[PDB]
Symmetry: C4
């Protein structure tokens, strides 16, 4: 009596009917019942119920029945144990906190990492490797984005902005830059019109941040025809809009893998970012106050102002110094010049190293896990599902 | 004879009675005795004693009986093995040092991470999410703490401290800052009085560092009425007391999780902090002496003073340079200017990188373990104890 | 019926013939067939097939048959499991992505880490420890390479380049340096001729980068006889060729182990290098643009130029500052001087720390694995293959 | 025939006599022989040999017999497997390189971490906690070492070295410093004489570096009586000897644990230190040459000297800049000022980060392992060897 033998994959597990009967509703509980013989695969010759499952983990499942705490066996992958306890009826949200982080790891990484001529029209936006025209158009858009960025960076230069003797006198940009900008705008407008030709699910097309960036970047040049008092303000904000013209590089870099992994890492490590920002804000505030007060101890009594010989004339300046010093950057534009100031400075450097090295390793481990998983899923050749499951 | 078969969870373990008899007082030892049959669950049909326990770890327990050294099986969580050996009677302080740190890990992290209208009065200090009035009062205290801190930081500024032509002539602060400070003091005194209304266990309320900070921060303004020769000294120390007014931000940030984890990490990594401070002190002293002597080799014989062309006129200046250089901060206010000085400087930079990267990774690993455990225990939904233990 | 017992190394595994029959072509599939008895080692007494293999992993192989997903048992080394599944017929490219990176790890590291007087002639290029003459010649070439490098570094100095009153007036190098260079060239030409005497597989000898470096380094001196208008250009490029004379140190350092491990790490971490370069390029571009525009907000309206008080007169200067600031180098030649500029600067420092600490740990882990494996394979004494395999 | 059943700890392992017979000389080989029955514990009832050992690892030992490669089971501590294979007769130097580093880890860390009134005389040098007089004398020597160090550091100061109007005119040190030095010398000489009173194994006492440092530090003061032409040279070298007076702090810090762990780490990581020094030397040389040549591209043709506007007037200056820049120190005393120089500078910063982060993590992991093991062995309470081994 009350002696039941479970045969799992050829390994006989023995236990009392009470231990099975503890956790109700689960399959083993139904086993403990008196009418189990009829319902299950039970042979009267050996008085053992036979289950065709991995025995090495059924040990741990039955252990959950015995003691009362479910743990993850550290010798099997999380998904294997997940599938086994799913079969046995155990809820996965019961595992002890000692095992939860190792267990729910692959599934977290996986979850985070996850009209006739219209195909030919849309073939200019598909992946470059998906065709030959696609790769050609991709190379061309790469060339033109790079040309736009170089024109921008050279337009801000002095050599290309001489000031003419024209009378108000201001520097003017060379015509060649404006011509190259016009060419790039013509090409980008052609691409944008071709991509507007076919726009399925136009709501998501407008919600697509890349097309938003494209349109905002192409707005300032096109506004040359549209553009006197309001015109000055709109030109002033048009410079700020043009400022985004460097953001067209994400159009090219979106097809990279490391960047998608970085996006997933950022989106999945919000808590650690908030933690880092809070740590830095507290450190900056405290050390700015401390250095501002330390540097006033040695202030000369002659000068009317409280601080004349110190860079730390107030606390916000302390904020700047504290950031530069905690990140071990150390420009040297402002540094302590009093023994008290030097003590506070040494404390700031050490505390900065520590409170920067606290959450950054968490973020780095997240990126490492996501990058390894993405590189694996990329490397692994497409499978043909060799295992034909039985009916 | 001397052949005993232990049946643990359906797996038959065989061993000699002598091996069991080695370690006395334990349950298996009692098994080895001649009257075990009567006391234990022994069936004469198979001459095997039956224990309803995990067999995969009973292997390792019996191994401790056999060889004489207790180890932790690396395929089970520390708590699972802890509970198993606790059942078998093995003392947990016997495990070999090769296994102690992996074993006693979760339990270390866990240990470190651990009248009618009076409920409505006290509801202003409970958690914000615990009510609606609570969250409102929390937002209001947040606004007022931030306003106090901004008033402080702007009060130390020059733009808000013009010097009037009043005759002694000193800069005076604008009235608007004093008015905002008065408002914030009124609000904080109202909060403090409401929280004094109900003060259970007043000894711990006074021992509560947060209320201490609150009272010390509210003392200087209230002392305006209380406050001639002693008055100058008390004002001088009152500025230093006001210096703490930035510490009211911990009142808000105490409810954050990362900060509690950081507090536990600090309190649990005292040894590594002392190690870091000793390493830095030795490095600073040695390299200050070395650079001070190196920079004198090339001293010009003309100048009467020993050092005129070097920033390293003495050793304490060496302390400052050595800290700035070992933390890879490198302000550039003082740097070596002699080939010997440059050799010593390169040695200082490398030795600083090394003796800073020695203990900091230990501290970082501590924080990582505590943060993962705290985030797990926060994420895991409240359990309902599905396992109804048998009587 | 449909009940088959597999005996693997004395452990009886039981399963249905259907589960074996799922995955076809594999050995167990052939077992499931009706004529298995004749073909395999089957004894009718126990109706069990006997396989002389590790049972602890046959559990996981049969689990692949049962569920349909192949995993790596985390309690056995990758090569052990590799050999077991190779025996059983399972393809190794079926393991789940959760296990692929741990599994295919040692094999990745291993793959990356992998006429009578002519022996006496060639003995001057073999390993130094391979003979006594070899070690002597190696020491001599070490001395002469070091002498060449020191002559170069002193030749570029001022103390050794006085300007004589000879009439055009230019500084000339001392004769002693030219004599030492001549001596070193004589020795290197003797070595190179002796090594040309015996040159098996001359195609790979010319493809050998070390000999290429040797010949390019020995070309400029020998060109003294060969060398008026073209002569000036060839001397100008000859200085640039001489620039390589420091590269002869790799001839000596090639026999070091850490350097070969570093070469293998570099060649095996191309993807992470491209990732680091893309991250740095995006960060540099974005932050250069941001700081250039931030620093113009506070520009004084008096000056005709857009920026007079800021170091950030254009964007490329921003590139330089952004690199120096993201690597936490912080020279201090250029730094923000406007509250907006300081905000952008703090963002640059933090983003640089983060996007530098993203891929560098991946690269560091690669080097650590390769270095541990190389040091192991070096330390382990040469084996004598104690296991005489059975026929 | 050729079917042998090994019973290890109640688990029946089955294999062919040939597989056992492969590896000769080992215990299992002797089992395979025809006269094994008489020699071993064999019962004819079940035709199984019984061994009272852990079965979970005998699986892997028999696997070595089967396949031919010995691996470490990743689910047992290295010492447990070591003892098991030691019992079975397997040589420990056979494990595959995939397992060698995990296996030989604890044993590496452990190996690296390892007349009547004469007891009362020597009690002044024993551990402080070993008595009360011992702790008192230790505190007193601490006070006096600290006083000596402070006297030294203040003696090098300007405030304590005024120059008197005595006629040659040089600064002289105050008498109070000389008096304090005399007091400290009296105390140290008393300690040294008391410790010379009892000097067992005087060869090792003289080889003891601490006593060497003590005697060298006490020599200069005592030489006041001993000390005209040679006297100036001996005073000049006496200043350099006094330079060691800061080394008396190791006398106190030797009893610390972290410092002994650091000493063991250094002594056990010589290879990685040599690797770091070689990496830094190659980087410094290459980047010094590169920056010196890059900065000359933009040299103005007017100046007679090759370089007038650049800090990089020669290559050794390049060595200094390259160290300061690769360690991300960045003083700012010298920095590139040409677009080519800036390119080379960015390369130097990145290459420095990389080739510094290559071996330093290896060294850091060594220190972490040694520190964890030492802290464990310190924490663990003294055992009483509960396991009374059987005869
Ligand atoms: C100001 C500079 C800050 C950057 C602004 C935001 C950059 C950005 O949004 O880039 C996103 C692309 C990914 O683009 P995607 O999401 O994979 O493809 C389009 C599909 N939609 C968007 C319609 C769902 O690329 C990325 O994921 C990069 C993420 C972070 C880059 C820094
Ligand atoms: C901790 C919380 C951080 C919050 C900091 C937010 C500050 C936002 C500023 C609001 C606008 C201020 C303003 O309008 O002007 C006030 C003055 C301007 O003064 P300025 O003349 O432009 O400053 C030049 C500094 N020199 C070089 C002359 C010494 O301002 C100044 O005098 C200098 C302002 C200093 C601000 C430096 C911010 C540094 C970043 C801190 C961020 C850390 C968070 C992580
Ligand atoms: C001068 C600046 C240095 C900081 C002074 C100390 C700051 C501090 O004490 O903050 C503590 C709070 C935690 O507050 P708590 O302990 O969780 O809540 C109150 C319960 N008592 C205190 C009664 C047991 O918050 C923290 O735990 C922060 C710990 C470290 C913050 C830096
Ligand atoms: C190793 C052990 C570290 C212990 C160091 C404790 C020092 C405590 C100081 C005690 C009080 C000293 C005093 O009263 O005045 C003495 C002088 C003051 O001289 P000062 O005029 O104020 O210094 C200005 C420096 N200029 C810029 C001119 C070059 O002082 C000076 O000349 C400069 C003092 C330099 C102190 C810098 C301390 C740097 C932090 C070291 C901490 C490392 C620990 C980790
Ligand atoms: C300009 C400076 C950049 C360095 C230029 C390239 C340096 C180099 O090529 O060194 C290679 C040697 C290894 O030499 P090796 O490959 O082992 O031996 C000769 C066999 N061959 C080449 C014929 C196949 O040494 C190395 O592997 C060092 C690799 C990286 C060193 C930095
Ligand atoms: C992001 C993508 C990075 C690509 C950057 C490539 C730049 C290649 C330069 C092409 C040739 C430029 C040229 O011929 O001359 C144009 C001017 C020269 O001006 P200069 O007088 O020689 O600069 C001196 C700077 N002072 C000190 C006066 C302020 O040039 C200048 O005004 C200064 C040029 C600044 C270049 C600094 C490069 C910093 C490295 C960035 C690399 C990061 C990649 C990781
Ligand atoms: C010039 C500064 C460089 C330091 C010079 C060497 C310092 C030193 O030797 O300190 C050693 C002590 C350990 O002293 P100990 O070895 O444990 O005790 C005496 C037993 N003997 C030595 C007789 C075997 O303390 C240490 O182990 C510290 C090791 C490294 C400290 C830096
Ligand atoms: C790579 C291999 C590294 C080996 C380097 C060993 C150098 C040893 C020096 C030998 C003695 C040199 C000598 O006697 O004098 C020659 C000159 C002295 O010139 P100085 O006037 O004293 O230098 C002052 C520099 N100012 C500030 C003026 C620009 O010397 C000079 O002009 C400046 C010498 C620059 C030496 C700086 C060494 C930086 C450390 C490199 C170590 C890296 C290894 C890791
Ligand atoms: K740094
Ligand atoms: K720095
Ligand atoms: K600097
Ligand atoms: K710096
Ligand atoms: Zn898996
Ligand atoms: Zn657990
Ligand atoms: Zn292995
Ligand atoms: Zn162990």
């Amino acid at each position: 009596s009350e002696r039941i033998v479970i045969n799992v994959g050829g390994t006989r597990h023995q236990t009392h009917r009470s231990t099975l009967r503890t956790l109700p509703g689960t399959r083993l509980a139904w086993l403990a019942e008196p009418d189990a013989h009829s319902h299950f695969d039970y042979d009267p010759r050996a008085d053992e119920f036979f289950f065709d499952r991995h025995p090495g983990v059924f040990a741990h499942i039955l252990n959950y029945y015995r003691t009362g705490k479910l743990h993850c066996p550290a010798d099997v992958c999380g998904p294997l144990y997940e599938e086994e306890l799913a079969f046995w009826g155990i809820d996965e949200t019961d595992v002890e906190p000692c095992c939860w982080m190792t267990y729910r790891q692959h599934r977290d990484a996986e979850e985070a990492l996850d009209r006739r001529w219209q195909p030919r029209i849309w073939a200019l936006f598909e992946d470059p490797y998906s065709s030959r025209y696609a790769r050609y158009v991709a190379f061309a858009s790469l060339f033109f984005i790079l040309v736009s960025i170089t024109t921008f960076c050279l337009e801000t230069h002095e050599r290309f902005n001489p000031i003419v003797n024209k009378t108000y006198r201001e520097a003017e940009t060379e015509a060649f830059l404006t011509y190259i900008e016009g060419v790039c705008v013509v090409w980008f407008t052609f691409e944008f019109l071709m991509r507007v030709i076919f726009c399925p699910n136009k709501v998501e097309f407008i919600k697509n941040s890349l097309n938003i960036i494209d349109f905002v970047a192409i707005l300032p040049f096109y506004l040359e025809v549209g553009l006197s008092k309001a015109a000055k303000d709109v030109l002033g904000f048009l410079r700020v809009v043009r400022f985004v013209r460097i953001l067209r590089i994400f159009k090219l870099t979106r097809h990279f893998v490391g960047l998608r992994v970085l996006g997933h890492t950022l989106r999945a490590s919000t808590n650690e970012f908030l933690l880092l920002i809070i740590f830095l804000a507290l450190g900056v505030l405290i050390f700015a106050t401390m250095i501002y007060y330390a540097e006033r101890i040695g202030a000369q009594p002659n000068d009317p102002s409280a601080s004349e010989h110190t860079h730390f004339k107030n606390i916000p300046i302390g904020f700047w110094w504290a950031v530069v010093t905690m990140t071990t950057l150390g420009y040297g534009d402002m540094y302590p010049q009093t023994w008290s100031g030097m003590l506070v400075g040494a404390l700031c450097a050490l505390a900065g190293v520590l409170t920067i090295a606290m959450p950054v390793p968490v973020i780095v481990n997240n990126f490492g896990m996501y990058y390894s998983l993405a590189m694996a899923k990329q490397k692994l050749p497409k499978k043909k599902k060799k295992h034909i499951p039985r009916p």
